[PDB]
Amino acid sequence: AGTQVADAPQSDNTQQRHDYLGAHQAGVVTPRPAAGLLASFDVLAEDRKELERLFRTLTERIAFLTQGGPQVDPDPRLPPTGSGILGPVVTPDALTITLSVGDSLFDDRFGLASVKPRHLQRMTAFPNDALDAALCHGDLSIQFCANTPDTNIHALRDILKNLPDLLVLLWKQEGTVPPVAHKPGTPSESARNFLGFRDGSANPDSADAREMNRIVWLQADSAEPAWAAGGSYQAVRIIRNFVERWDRTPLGEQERIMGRAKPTGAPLDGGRTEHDVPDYAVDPKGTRTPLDSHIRLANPRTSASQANLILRRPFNYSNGVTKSGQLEMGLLFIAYQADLDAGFITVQKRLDGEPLEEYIKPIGGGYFFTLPGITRADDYFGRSLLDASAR
Numbered sequence: 001a002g003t004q005v006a007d008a009p010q011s012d013n014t015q016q017r018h019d020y021l022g023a024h025q026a027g028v029v030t031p032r033p034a035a036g037l038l039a040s041f042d043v044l045a046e047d048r049k050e051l052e053r054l055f056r057t058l059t060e061r062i063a064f065l066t067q068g069g070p071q072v073d074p075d076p077r078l079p080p081t082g083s084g085i086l087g088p089v090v091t092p093d094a095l096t097i098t099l100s101v102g103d104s105l106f107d108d109r110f111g112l113a114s115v116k117p118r119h120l121q122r123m124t125a126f127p128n129d130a131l132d133a134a135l136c137h138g139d140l141s142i143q144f145c146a147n148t149p150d151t152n153i154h155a156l157r158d159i160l161k162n163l164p165d166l167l168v169l170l171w172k173q174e175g176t177v178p179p180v181a182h183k184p185g186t187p188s189e190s191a192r193n194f195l196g197f198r199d200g201s202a203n204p205d206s207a208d209a210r211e212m213n214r215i216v217w218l219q220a221d222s223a224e225p226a227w228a229a230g231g232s233y234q235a236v237r238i239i240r241n242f243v244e245r246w247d248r249t250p251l252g253e254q255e256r257i258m259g260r261a262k263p264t265g266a267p268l269d270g271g272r273t274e275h276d277v278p279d280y281a282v283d284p285k286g287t288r289t290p291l292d293s294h295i296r297l298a299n300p301r302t303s304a305s306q307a308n309l310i311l312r313r314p315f316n317y318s319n320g321v322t323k324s325g326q327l328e329m330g331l332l333f334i335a336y337q338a339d340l341d342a343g344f345i346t347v348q349k350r351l352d353g354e355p356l357e358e359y360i361k362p363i364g365g366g367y368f369f370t371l372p373g374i375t376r377a378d379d380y381f382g383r384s385l386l387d388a389s390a391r
């Protein structure tokens with residue numbers, strides 16, 4: 001293959017396509033691809049008209065970018081239609097774009113406060129946090145997922161190109177997960193995090209609409225405002241890993257901080273695969289699965305704890321080198337739940353003081369409400385929020 005050194009890699013994955021219409025936005029129960037980008041913005045709109053145009057315009061960009069197609073530049077004296085990163089024919093590359101609104105959007109600016117989702121709130125500092133003020137909150141989060149980082153970056157460029165007057169980017173975190181070798185005829189396997197552990201084994205069934213309806217998605221008739229039906233609460237946490245320290249920790253200690261076997265992801269009390277679960281009823285004292293191990297604290301597997309299940313959808317992030325010359329990398333923790341208080345906050349409240357904290361440090365993120373989907377291309381994300389607020 002007389003391939004030139006700068007030839008672009010070729011991949012059949014570029015034409016994969018996820019629909020952006022539905023009862024829900026894509027990117028929540030959609031299978032997580034190899035590349036991710038979570039960006040936070042402040043809305044610069046000064047009124048309900050400009051906020052409507054922002055919602056209409058984001059929708060328009062989502063429809064094109066996630067489905068792809070030709071991009072014609074109108075005239076040489078004008079800026080080009082887009083950045084051109086994906087060529088004159090934009091490829092979707094399995095891109096999903098998920099829109100979520102922060103607590104701060106429901107201030108006095110737009111007259112939405114009286115229909116704010118009832119668990120929506122500003123993220124507050126947990127005891128092991130070292131929050132960078134510049135990495136927290138935002139009027140609007142946008143989660144981009146695609147097969148390769150250039151597709152999310154291209155989507156980011158396009159949105160900022162078309163809304164530089166209504167959006168200011170505040171902070172962003174890109175991330176990835178390591179793909180595994182194909183192997184048809186084997187159970188699918190959970191991606192690893194940068195601590196080298198399988199990450200997602202005990203997620204609830206993302207392919208089970210009944211399970212998602214009671215764990216992830218807001219339901220119509222409930223204590224929530226009716227417009228918010230089909231949305232979800234989104235918790236984002238930028239979590240440093242002190243990796244050099246971790247890599248100097250004995251394997252057996254890594255396994256009892258996490259409470260799973262490292263190479264397999266199996267329970268520490270038996271079972272071969274990562275789909276097995278420990279039996280805490282058998283082990284009340286934590287002699288197989290430590291009481292203070294990460295999983296056992298995150299989910300003690302009591303009947304009461306089934307109210308605190310969450311859907312994790314993380315990426316791994318690599319940001320550079322610190323001043324003591326250590327790798328600036330960690331977890332881009334993203335999680336969805338029908339109830340933010342019973343979910344992420346309760347779980348993190350259980351996790352405070354866990355031994356893992358010796359190796360991790362949340363530095364940023366915030367809480368957002370992922371908006372309901374649209375089934376009608378005449379419709380647009382955020383519309384029901386504007387109408388509900390309009391009584």
Ligand code: HEM
Pocket residue numbers: 193195197198199200201202203237239240241258260294295296298299310330331333335343344347348351360
């Ligand atoms: C960088 C920090 C973290 C790492 C490396 C990490 C890693 C892991 C690993 C390896 C598992 C076991 C496999 C699995 O069931 O998915 C797990 C489980 C879990 N993690 Fe985390 N995690 C981190 C932070 C968090 C945080 C902040 C939460 C807060 C909500 C959380 C919630 C959970 C839950 C609910 C489970 C499932 C426990 C179970 O049902 O057995 N994790 N985590």
